[PDB]
Amino acid sequence: HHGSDLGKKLLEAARAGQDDEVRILMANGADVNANDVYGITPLHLAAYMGHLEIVEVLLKYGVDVNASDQFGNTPLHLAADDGHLEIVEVLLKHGTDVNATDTWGSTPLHLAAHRGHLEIVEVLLKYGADVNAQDKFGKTAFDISIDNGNEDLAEILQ
Amino acid sequence: GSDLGKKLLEAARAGQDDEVRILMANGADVNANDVYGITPLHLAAYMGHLEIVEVLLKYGVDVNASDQFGNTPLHLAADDGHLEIVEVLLKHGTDVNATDTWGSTPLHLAAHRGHLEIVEVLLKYGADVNAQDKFGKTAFDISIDNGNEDLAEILQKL
């Protein structure tokens, strides 16, 4: 009767990594797909910040794993970029689009390549990442690895 | 060039008021923006940095700056519940009835979130209670859809 501001509190809890708070908010009807003005969701924030226990909680409540914020970020982009292998693995096992492109044309593979996350690149390739995809700078993941002189990465991408 | 713009966006995001002043003196564009049209004032409003808002105002920032999605900084502050920032933006003449790309005014967003004290101040500064977003909804309609009886009582009298 007096409104419930649980969506905002969930976003704050996911961003802060308050694992028990996320559980409690979800147990009391908080919208698992809450978002802010820019479409950023608790799963986006957990994925970028590396909060695996929170990711798993949201997965218990049927979160949209492929939600895009206003910038074209999906949770898989964000975990791949910031090097959170365990979250990447989980998202891929829950049906996240492996070749989703953000507003820069980057797939998760591009982002993992830019940051030198070799294990993440490997699991992305295992789940069908497209090595031919060019971002809107015209770069493949291979091109990025060469631009960065990352020999190990260039070896993985052939 | 736009190197100072990037630096100013980040100083506003981080709440570094001394760095803002330094960058303005270096020739930074007070209305610099990223590729999404998001300005330092947008980031200060989003992050709740009242002091940054005050400093940018003194350096002639445009409080009606709109991003790619039609958000002014007033949208961001009103959606997140930042009373002080909402007040100072209105006091410096921001368009209280600015609409984003879905026709939402700040009153709509504040209604969606149940921010009663921000609804009060928005109304005080001339918010349009009859404004409809692109879904045909007024702020009063939103409060009915949400079951927020406190909010509806405020708005229904209007």
């Binding site: 970028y48 964000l78 953000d102 | -």
Partner: peptide
């Protein structure tokens, strides 16, 4: 968290 280049990464960057 340290800022990083990328789409809207500012909004994902708070505190350290």
């Amino acid at each position: 968290k340290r800022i990083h280049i990328g789409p809207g990464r500012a909004f994902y960057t708070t505190x350290p």
